[PDB]
Amino acid sequence: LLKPRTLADLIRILHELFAGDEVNVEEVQAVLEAYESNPADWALYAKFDQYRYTRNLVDQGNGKFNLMILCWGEGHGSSIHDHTDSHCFLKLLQGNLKETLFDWPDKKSNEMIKKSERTLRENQCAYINDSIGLHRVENVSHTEPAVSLHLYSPPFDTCHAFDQRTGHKNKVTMTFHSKFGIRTP
Ligand SMILES: [Fe+3]
């Protein structure tokens, strides 16, 4: 496990770590954390939208994981969501994100209430999966966009969004704003 000097080396070490069947979560998190965000490395993926956060595919991990860059304008956030029985690693490349943790709801319609919340700062790496809980990610800044590096394994095309007032969930199809630096139709 060596310190990645650049995004490209980070991706090379990631392919080595996911070469097997089973993920060593702590080692992935440690190496994502060790990568010191350099904007020159990832400017190509930092494609923003005025109305909501964008998902920008970087690498498909030989089918073992999706590595993608998310671009969060001021005030942009996600729904409360799950991660489709996959691992989710979330590293801050620039700015700050607020993460709010929720428990899976009862089957009785009730307001979802937060377990916790925390700020993720530049270069920190958060980890989550469905056995830990659900979560919402937002850029609450009024002045600074955020950029995060997300790694899901196994990859998934769809997830669930949760309505904070009832806990009822609906299915959501992930959209890509770009793939490999190329904007999608
Ligand atoms: Fe998430």
Curated annotation (Swiss-Prot):
Subunit structure of this chain's protein: Monomer.
Keywords assigned: Dioxygenase, Iron, Metal-binding, Oxidoreductase, Thioether bond
Tissue: Highest levels in liver. Significant expression also in kidney, lung and brain.
Name of the featured protein: Cysteine dioxygenase type 1
Biological function: Catalyzes the oxidation of cysteine to cysteine sulfinic acid with addition of molecular dioxygen.
CDD domains linked to this entry: cupin_CDO
This protein's encoding gene: Cdo1
One Gene Ontology term, aspect cellular component: cytosol
Residue positions binding Fe cation: H81, H83, H135
Example of a GO MF term: zinc ion binding
Transmembrane parts of this sequence: none
E.C. number: 1.13.11.20
UniProt cofactor(s): Fe cation; Ni(2+); Zn(2+)
Enzyme class, first EC level, given as a word: oxidoreductase
Pathway field: Organosulfur biosynthesis; taurine biosynthesis; hypotaurine from L-cysteine: step 1/2
Posttranslational mods: The thioether cross-link between Cys-88 and Tyr-152 plays a structural role through stabilizing the Fe(2+) ion, and prevents the production of highly damaging free hydroxyl radicals by holding the oxygen radical via hydroxyl hydrogen.
Species per Swiss-Prot/TrEMBL record: Rattus norvegicus (Rat)
Pfam families: CDO_I
Matching InterPro entries: CDO_1 (IPR010300), RmlC-like_jellyroll (IPR014710), RmlC_Cupin_sf (IPR011051)
Membership in a protein family: Belongs to the cysteine dioxygenase family.
Lineage of origin: Eukaryota, Metazoa, Chordata, Craniata, Vertebrata
Induction: By increase of sulfur amino acid intake.
Position of the 3'-(S-cysteinyl)-tyrosine (Cys-Tyr) cross-link: C88-Y152
